[PDB]
Design an enzyme around this catalytic site. Structure first.
Site, PDB file in Angstrom:
ATOM      1  N   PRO A   1     -10.134   9.198  -1.636  1.00  0.00           N
ATOM      2  CA  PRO A   1      -9.751   8.993  -0.020  1.00  0.00           C
ATOM      3  C   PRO A   1      -7.739   9.608  -0.147  1.00  0.00           C
ATOM      4  O   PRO A   1      -7.642   9.788   0.320  1.00  0.00           O
ATOM      5  CB  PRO A   1     -10.541   8.173   0.466  1.00  0.00           C
ATOM      6  CG  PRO A   1     -10.954   6.751  -0.799  1.00  0.00           C
ATOM      7  CD  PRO A   1     -10.619   7.758  -2.131  1.00  0.00           C
TER       8      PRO A   1
ATOM      9  N   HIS B   1      -0.185   2.674 -14.004  1.00  0.00           N
ATOM     10  CA  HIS B   1      -0.666   3.447 -12.264  1.00  0.00           C
ATOM     11  C   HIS B   1       0.208   3.467 -10.846  1.00  0.00           C
ATOM     12  O   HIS B   1       1.421   2.952 -11.464  1.00  0.00           O
ATOM     13  CB  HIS B   1      -1.161   1.506 -11.979  1.00  0.00           C
ATOM     14  CG  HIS B   1      -1.263   1.327 -10.448  1.00  0.00           C
ATOM     15  ND1 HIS B   1      -2.315   1.706 -10.428  1.00  0.00           N
ATOM     16  CD2 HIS B   1      -0.612   0.567  -9.899  1.00  0.00           C
ATOM     17  CE1 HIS B   1      -1.910   0.700  -9.002  1.00  0.00           C
ATOM     18  NE2 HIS B   1      -1.067   0.160  -8.830  1.00  0.00           N
ATOM     19  N   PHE B   2       0.171   3.831  -9.545  1.00  0.00           N
ATOM     20  CA  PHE B   2       0.346   4.829  -8.632  1.00  0.00           C
ATOM     21  C   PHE B   2       0.353   3.281  -7.623  1.00  0.00           C
ATOM     22  O   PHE B   2      -0.393   3.481  -7.140  1.00  0.00           O
ATOM     23  CB  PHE B   2       0.384   5.901  -8.440  1.00  0.00           C
ATOM     24  CG  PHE B   2       1.775   5.631  -8.168  1.00  0.00           C
ATOM     25  CD1 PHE B   2       1.321   6.119  -6.019  1.00  0.00           C
ATOM     26  CD2 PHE B   2       2.349   6.872  -8.068  1.00  0.00           C
ATOM     27  CE1 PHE B   2       3.220   6.764  -6.060  1.00  0.00           C
ATOM     28  CE2 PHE B   2       3.383   7.379  -7.281  1.00  0.00           C
ATOM     29  CZ  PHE B   2       3.749   6.840  -6.240  1.00  0.00           C
ATOM     30  N   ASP B   3       1.311   2.378  -7.721  1.00  0.00           N
ATOM     31  CA  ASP B   3       1.696   1.409  -7.054  1.00  0.00           C
ATOM     32  C   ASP B   3       1.450   1.699  -5.426  1.00  0.00           C
ATOM     33  O   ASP B   3       1.362   1.208  -4.695  1.00  0.00           O
ATOM     34  CB  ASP B   3       2.471   0.218  -6.888  1.00  0.00           C
ATOM     35  CG  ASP B   3       1.776  -1.574  -6.854  1.00  0.00           C
ATOM     36  OD1 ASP B   3       0.633  -1.658  -6.434  1.00  0.00           O
ATOM     37  OD2 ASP B   3       2.691  -1.441  -5.410  1.00  0.00           O
TER      38      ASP B   3
ATOM     39  N   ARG C   1      -4.206  12.878   1.416  1.00  0.00           N
ATOM     40  CA  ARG C   1      -4.659  12.004   2.033  1.00  0.00           C
ATOM     41  C   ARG C   1      -6.360  12.482   2.502  1.00  0.00           C
ATOM     42  O   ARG C   1      -6.253  13.831   3.420  1.00  0.00           O
ATOM     43  CB  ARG C   1      -4.540  11.183   3.058  1.00  0.00           C
ATOM     44  CG  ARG C   1      -4.996  10.418   4.173  1.00  0.00           C
ATOM     45  CD  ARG C   1      -5.053   8.859   4.291  1.00  0.00           C
ATOM     46  NE  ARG C   1      -3.945   8.808   3.716  1.00  0.00           N
ATOM     47  CZ  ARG C   1      -3.901   7.174   3.445  1.00  0.00           C
ATOM     48  NH1 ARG C   1      -4.497   6.093   3.906  1.00  0.00           N
ATOM     49  NH2 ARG C   1      -2.959   6.640   2.831  1.00  0.00           N
TER      50      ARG C   1
ATOM     51  N   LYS D   1       1.280  -4.477  -5.486  1.00  0.00           N
ATOM     52  CA  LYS D   1       0.455  -4.708  -4.276  1.00  0.00           C
ATOM     53  C   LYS D   1      -0.285  -5.755  -4.448  1.00  0.00           C
ATOM     54  O   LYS D   1      -0.678  -6.403  -3.959  1.00  0.00           O
ATOM     55  CB  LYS D   1      -0.046  -3.382  -3.692  1.00  0.00           C
ATOM     56  CG  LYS D   1      -0.499  -3.812  -2.451  1.00  0.00           C
ATOM     57  CD  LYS D   1       0.435  -2.285  -1.748  1.00  0.00           C
ATOM     58  CE  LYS D   1      -0.172  -0.688  -2.155  1.00  0.00           C
ATOM     59  NZ  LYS D   1      -1.363  -1.181  -2.234  1.00  0.00           N
TER      60      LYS D   1
ATOM     61  N   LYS E   1      -4.511   8.864 -17.943  1.00  0.00           N
ATOM     62  CA  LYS E   1      -5.245   9.017 -16.521  1.00  0.00           C
ATOM     63  C   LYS E   1      -4.573   8.549 -15.398  1.00  0.00           C
ATOM     64  O   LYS E   1      -4.223   9.690 -14.681  1.00  0.00           O
ATOM     65  CB  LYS E   1      -6.073   7.470 -16.258  1.00  0.00           C
ATOM     66  CG  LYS E   1      -6.973   7.456 -15.153  1.00  0.00           C
ATOM     67  CD  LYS E   1      -7.411   6.680 -14.601  1.00  0.00           C
ATOM     68  CE  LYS E   1      -8.568   6.658 -13.861  1.00  0.00           C
ATOM     69  NZ  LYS E   1      -9.475   5.364 -14.368  1.00  0.00           N
TER      70      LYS E   1
ATOM     71  N   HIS F   1      -1.106  11.596 -11.244  1.00  0.00           N
ATOM     72  CA  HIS F   1      -0.151  11.671 -10.551  1.00  0.00           C
ATOM     73  C   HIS F   1       0.550  12.401 -11.336  1.00  0.00           C
ATOM     74  O   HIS F   1       1.597  13.196 -10.308  1.00  0.00           O
ATOM     75  CB  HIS F   1       0.274  10.264 -10.539  1.00  0.00           C
ATOM     76  CG  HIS F   1      -0.817   9.509 -10.283  1.00  0.00           C
ATOM     77  ND1 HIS F   1      -1.171   9.594  -9.092  1.00  0.00           N
ATOM     78  CD2 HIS F   1      -1.384   8.617 -10.962  1.00  0.00           C
ATOM     79  CE1 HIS F   1      -1.831   8.209  -8.678  1.00  0.00           C
ATOM     80  NE2 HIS F   1      -2.175   7.786  -9.740  1.00  0.00           N
TER      81      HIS F   1
END
Length: 124
Positions: free
Chosen positions: A42, A119-121, A85, A66, A7, A12
């Site tokens: 979003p 995961h992309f922080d 975005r 984060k 994923k 990404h």
């Protein structure tokens, strides 16, 4: 189901290009990566580096995530990335995205075996 590592790659990774070629890149990629089906995602970030170069970030500077988690890593060097975005005038199911190209450090959370980005922080 989709594994957390597959994923992160689908959302990404974009090593085929060196960087966002046009202002329609985000509208294009957000669509070919399946990120606008049940709603318009979003915000999303694409990295134009080799998958290997992005997995090696899991062995670089360890920093807080984060969310407080302590399994995040910041790339030593800056990487080519594109920021997508959702624009104010975007409407499900016709998503509109502002594409911003940039060179920055990426911060990803790594997990499991082997230690791969899951995961992309953020980027800085």
């Amino acid at each position: 189901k989709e594994t957390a590592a597959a994923k992160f790659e689908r959302q990404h990774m974009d090593s085929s290009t060196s960087a966002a070629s046009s202002s329609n890149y985000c509208n294009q990629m957000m669509k070919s990566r399946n990120l606008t089906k049940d709603r318009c995602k979003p915000v999303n970030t694409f990295v134009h580096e080799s998958l290997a170069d992005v997995q090696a970030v899991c062995s670089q500077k360890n920093v807080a995530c984060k969310n407080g988690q302590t399994n995040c890593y910041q790339s030593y060097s800056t990487m080519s990335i594109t920021d997508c975005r959702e624009t104010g005038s975007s409407k499900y199911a016709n998503c509109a995205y502002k594409t911003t190209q940039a060179n920055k450090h990426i911060i990803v959370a790594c997990e499991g075996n082997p230690y791969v980005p899951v995961h992309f922080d953020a980027s800085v």
